[PDB]
Symmetry: D2
Subunit: 494 residues, 4 copies
């Protein structure tokens, strides 16, 4: 069931959201926001800078003060507000999916059926945790009563990427709010719009002012302001590994603010000779090509055992030749554009290395169309490990297919990277499935599938693919700060 | 019961410990180690540098490899090795306490009765966790079986301070080993000796080679090598907040290694008019003066309600005038020296600010003796908030006593610091105890006591007093890395 | 805000609810349901017997089969259905509160503001747990992968009392459904009506057929059928301790079905001389008199320290003399009737023992009105331990006030009972609050309050006041059955 | 490495152990204890009856009193005592294994290498939990501070079977003591001796008097006294399902004491056509034949897919023909006797039903020797579901092998029993392994193995094979009683 918006979308919310009201920028500057499919300007949005981040942090800090409505309300009521926010996003699902598609260059079918469904489900999941965050009573040595409080940390700075704007917004704000924090969100310069609509719904839902503040703008200005701020308690960032290093560095320099990072990858799949071949081809395909390759988990190195390698490449290539490029809003279209020029160039530049360094181009390998940042879906076979396309995150519709014959060696090759976000193992053998997934240095390991993400399980990177986890029970720990309270008593009893 | 060593202590272990063997430094340089009470050289120890840290990390990495003895042994057996290590430390308790006293400038009674007891107890606590570290099975959306592995992270770099050398060594290695990590430990340049004895006991206990590697040396060389190493997965550091910022920065610059920091404080006590006055005086006293003030939790701002302030100061001062300074090995001695010159100067320099900025000197305020880094126990009353002695961590035997009359205001004053390691609340009122301890921005809040530390509860700082927690159930999380494994199945059932 | 129903209530649902359809009884018998305030017949309801319970269990068993919709749906979707049920109960809050008031003899203000609010909140709480029920991955000795599944148990028989019909229905079905069980509910013979309305809302919400089946009827017939059934996996019962013993016995005789029991009490309060006197009087008052004394937690022995005893009795008695008896639907009325004749007689019979055994009657002590099972609010002072009114659960508006002078002795006296559901401690002293609450053999201990129940914390009895806990995280364990799955592997790694 | 005792074993401890001293029976009666291999009397032991159980419960109750040494000692110290007990059992491993072999009819190699190793390991596991039992702090609605205490329950009655006397003793006392309970243990009438030696080691280790009391004697006298006692808080029983029903019934009749039951089974294995055939044969073999078939988990129905059935039967039969019967103390002996006459008769009687009801006798099927309760190892093929040997627990060395061709049907057949202790699944297919183990109504499901038991994972039965779980984290819950403490406060903050 794929319903659509009957009237044309109008952009309404374009301002900095602080204390549940709409603010002009302190400078009074604004910045344009584009459709990546047409290269046309959609609207202008107020440009937040350091001065605006400062207003946002003061609002967050006041909303966090002992005795405030957000600190004193029942945990169950924090949950209620979150479930209300989810109902409102559900009510505005058509509007949000359309805006997400138009601004993000994201296929509308996927925006509506996956992105918005995952947004609503993740919020509902997080709402349920709010009054289930618990500390401990602890049988300490000596005559003492010891308990712990898993408090909110405080003001959390949250920097959101452009590839899944709504999903990433909710992955940040859901847990942070469930645990009782206040937030200053900086959506991506490319994709501020859907977040600003969500902010209007945060107001409608009745969150106390200052609990969520959204400051659109650029990364080197507003993002740097967040990462170096002396009164932000924690920064959460999803994006490139390069920028992640700057975030962590700045946190260290400033006020030792807590850090979680969800970064890029060069995620490997290992396809054994006994694998269901079609299932492995289909999931490895979608594993690399989903959302024009603009997923941190992109299955960008597919190692296939020699005896099934040729047949894997053949079947893969024919699956890649089935796409229909164009406007993601038009039904039947199955591949939209890349987000912007910067990304578009890096993709094409990396495609050229594949050719020059001697990979076998099976299909694609150039641009498409008169407008929009479109790249033909590209498959390279006979890829080797020291090639640029096997080392660097492409973030584009570019599949690398490698051969192996030794399992020990292909595991070393899979692990031979500074990345470690995710990986895939395709086999019918129980022992292989368990032992290989244990040996892979990856945060999520999928077995006979790929790209299966859900609110109930933790998600994040090994190595330079991240610090910490988001979602699941485990991810909620990083939005709490633990206080131990130890009380002298005359005599304890067990 | 205070037994002693019958023969004089001989120093035996003075070398870099890698792969369970004793190594000369790569350069071949050595550095002297001193008794702080006599200023005499005790011995020379091999000086580890970047080149030696590199040998230690390669050993740790090999011991961590899939299929190694440490990775494949039963969790219960990791526990057994840890409980064996504790039995060996218990066997060598006299030797270790004497060495700890002589090298650290630490009162022997405290070394034997508290430091060594806490070392043994913490190891035994950690041993019990080893086969109780568990992941989850998760009711993910869709037809999938999802489980998590709480794996060890890998090679953990661990930098240990000089104030509690043995206790801090065990606080690091106990949890890291219980969870299955391998470690490269850099004990403090001032106090390498007790760690090198523990390393001999790690060998005796039968830990596989490379699981624990100890590299003595200086902070700016060996410590920097650890913090910037591209194949260390995690750094744990206890020390100054200043150096903590350098550690976190370097982690960001290098390989985004995971970070936990246990840093300094300017920890406040709030003494209400209804408090048991003598109990508050005794705990606030020991809270600031323990181990010559060289505790990160030093209760270095004591706020007392006006109506009991004069009587609190009087009783405090007379308690401070009861000390006997000298060699910590001599029975009856109740105050040893500061660790070294650098610390000694900072202490005296800060004592001079108290005088010049107009605090009331009640006793002390100068040095003591012909040898040793001794400082007279010092009490200042009528201390105000903008004084250096109320803002800066002294790390010396220097008590600050402040007056207050408003509870709201004294809580703001208590929280008005970038620090937040711990705090104390003294009152008989149930509501005051709970509400004040909730409102304090401190990692541990003691009620009608101070400095009660135990293996069963988590310990660490709010704000710039730390990132993360050590010990308790909660502290064990930061020595694991969580992997989600999601397996496609034909049909799930609840 | 106390809104009311504008039209008169009409009874609609009067039949046995199996497989989401309305069934006549197998015999074809029906039984009358009365208003306790007027003694008038409200309607007739279909009388379930053993033959009907058998139809209900076959439906529950089929809905529980591997591959069924309830077993295969996402846990998150079980949660969604529960949150939907809560929205529907909220929509029908006026109707439900009126029906609850009219059938249960329950003050409408309390029905609407407390009972229905707690019903809605408990369901929403339980909904949030559904996809957060998790097993473990376990570092077993040897080369094995071990995980656990916290499965639903299966068909759960649930017997609901008459004192809080809606709240008790939801306390049973919320957790049992959240965990994935199917249920056969037997509401009290006195109060079947509100449950049958909830069943219509279970249908409307879209729960698969057979997941909830409701069989009204009598205890000795339908309740016994449930407790002895050979294909019911678990029985949950709230009611008298006497019947609880029969339930547990029958479970043993039949198929060793799992048992949880929430039974009666003779719950004590200990009021120390330093207590806030008015707060202690107010909470102890409401602690015994709430819902005409028909609470399992009734604070039916109030021990007050000698020096404040007279003043406690005086203030208590004047609070008890403020009630307005009558129809619970009429505004201004502050005390409704007892549920039925059986209860009414036991209450009056026990009031007579108080008089005959020599308690001091301060007020009340007889019946009220021309119709309805009304008992005057009664206060006895100078009650002693071997009196019937100090040993037996009255379940009526009858307060017992005792004196004590020794704390050790009053704790023994408080604990000197086969009961142990709850207790109260009133004092300003931190140490007394902690030590007394630790020493009381009671499932819930309130400090400076009484009767504070919430979905987030576990609730149940020590001793013959119950087996197991309901609600909180802990209560959810008893609606799961744990399966260990141990898989042979070639080699494990930590 | 199989070492032995150099001198002959002498029996020393033969008396009732209460308050850490040795008691004659109240009557003054004694009962004989036999070697099952020779039918010779080993010694006489003091016969505990109801009057002796009463002395034991009064001792347990006093040791449990608030303020006692056991209630007030550090949790860590309960752990220490347990680890000390394990060291003492390790010291006496030869003595204990010999006594266990001689009294229990248990192969000495298995007694020494498995039973004693598992005893020591389980105790060490349990010791580690003692100071890691924790309650919660809970974000309750309203202005309250709520925490929970996971208290010990109190006096726990523990009834131990004869098949694994030491292992079962430690499975009971380890968790119960770790959690802070006191115990009254009734070892099996057949095998009291090893428990009485352990009691001497409990004294030596320094457990406070009354914490462990051991009352040897018969089941219908001392066991019934335990199950019906009005001051025992909990009964734990391992044995027949028949007696389990009597225990649960008596608990209900008496004081609603908490119950856990570990009962018998008729545990199925499902061997798929793709299974490693030799591995399935070897584990299914040991799964049924271990300890002369006297395991509650006996794999007593082996369903094998038709196409590999004949080859499975052939290989199974030849494995069964390899045994050497005799005295379990003699090296080379690989099968000892059944425990006693009662068991011996039931086994032979059930073997006769197999023959008369038309099973194919492949080997065995009669007694062996001139003395001792020896039964030839017996294999039946072509067993059908309504045969006595496929329905009733034999508890003897008697294997049943069945054929199947439909997976759906064989799962129904596997689940078609009132039992549900364990099961086995043998296959190479990932999906089959997960889906079949989910669908089996069994507490432990082994995949490509059988009889893998370890301290780290919970163990117990579905259906009439048990109530509750022992060991693992989960099993520790049933030795705690949860208390909720809810404290009124002026204002809460998250
Ligand atoms: C829409 C998905 S998130 C997601 N889905 C994907 C991806 C690739 N294919 N698919 C189908 C993906 O990368 N992602 C994705 C993965 C990781 C991240 C963050 C950092 O990598 C963002 C999106 C979801 C599902 C349930 C609940 C919430 C969200
Ligand atoms: C010996 C103690 S640790 C400790 N004890 C102290 C301190 C001050 N007074 N006392 C008595 C202290 O600072 N400490 C202390 C506190 C924090 C840290 C680390 C970072 O601050 C180190 C020592 C112990 C007890 C049980 C188990 C293990 C150890
Ligand atoms: Cl905690
Ligand atoms: Cl997890
Ligand atoms: Cl579990
Ligand atoms: Cl709890
Ligand atoms: Yb162009
Ligand atoms: Yb000097
Ligand atoms: Yb009447
Ligand atoms: Yb015979």
């Amino acid at each position: 069931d794929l319903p659509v918006l009957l009237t044309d979308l109008k952009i309404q919310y374009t301002k900095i959201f602080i204390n549940n009201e709409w603010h002009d920028s302190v400078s009074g500057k604004k910045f344009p926001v584009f459709n990546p499919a047409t290269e046309e300007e959609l609207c202008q949005v107020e440009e937040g800078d350091k001065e605006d981040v400062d207003k946002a942090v003061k609002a967050a800090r006041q909303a966090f003060q002992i005795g405030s409505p957000w600190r004193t309300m029942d945990a169950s009521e924090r949950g209620r507000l979150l479930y209300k926010l989810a109902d409102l996003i559900e009510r505005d699902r058509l509007l949000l999916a359309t805006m997400e598609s138009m601004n993000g260059g994201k296929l509308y079918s996927n925006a509506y059926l996956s992105d918005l469904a995952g947004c609503i489900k993740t919020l509902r999941y997080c709402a349920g945790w709010a009054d289930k965050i618990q500390g401990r009573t602890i049988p300490i040595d000596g005559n003492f009563f010891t308990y712990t409080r898993h408090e909110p940390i405080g003001v959390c700075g949250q920097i959101i990427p452009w590839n899944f704007p709504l999903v990433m917004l909710i992955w940040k704000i859901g847990p942070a709010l469930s645990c009782g924090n206040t937030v200053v969100v900086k959506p991506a310069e490319q994709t501020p719009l859907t977040a600003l609509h969500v902010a209007s719904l945060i107001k409608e839902a009745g969150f106390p002012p200052g609990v969520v503040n959204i400051v659109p703008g650029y990364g080197p200005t507003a993002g740097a302001a967040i990462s170096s701020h002396m009164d932000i308690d924690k920064v959460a960032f999803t994006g490139s590994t390069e920028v992640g290093k700057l975030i962590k560095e700045a946190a260290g320099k400033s006020n030792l603010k807590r850090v979680t990072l969800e970064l890029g990858g060069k995620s490997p799949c290992i396809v054994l000779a006994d694998a269901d071949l079609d299932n492995a081809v289909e999931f490895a395909h979608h594993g690399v090509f989903y959302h024009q390759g603009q997923c941190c988990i992109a299955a960008s190195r597919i190692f296939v055992e020699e005896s099934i390698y040729d047949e894997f490449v053949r079947r893969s290539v024919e699956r890649a030749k089935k796409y229909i490029l164009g406007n993601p809003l038009t039904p039947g279209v199955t591949q939209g554009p890349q987000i912007d020029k910067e990304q578009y160039d890096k993709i094409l530049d990396l495609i050229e290395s594949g050719k020059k360094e001697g990979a076998k181009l099976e299909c694609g390998g150039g641009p498409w169309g008169n407008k929009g940042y479109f790249v033909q879906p590209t498959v390279f076979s006979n890829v080797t490990d020291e090639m640029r396309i096997a080392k660097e995150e492409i973030f584009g519709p570019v599949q690398q297919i490698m051969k192996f014959k030794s399992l020990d060696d292909v595991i070393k090759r899979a692990n031979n990277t500074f990345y470690g976000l995710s990986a895939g193992v395709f086999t019918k053998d129980i022992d292989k499935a368990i032992t290989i997934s244990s040996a892979l240095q990856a945060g999520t390991v999928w077995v006979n599938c790929y790209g299966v993400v859900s609110a109930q399980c933790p998600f994040g990177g090994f190595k330079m693919s991240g610090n910490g986890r988001e979602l699941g029970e485990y991810g909620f720990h990083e939005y709490t700060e633990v206080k131990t309270v130890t009380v002298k008593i005359s005599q304890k009893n067990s």
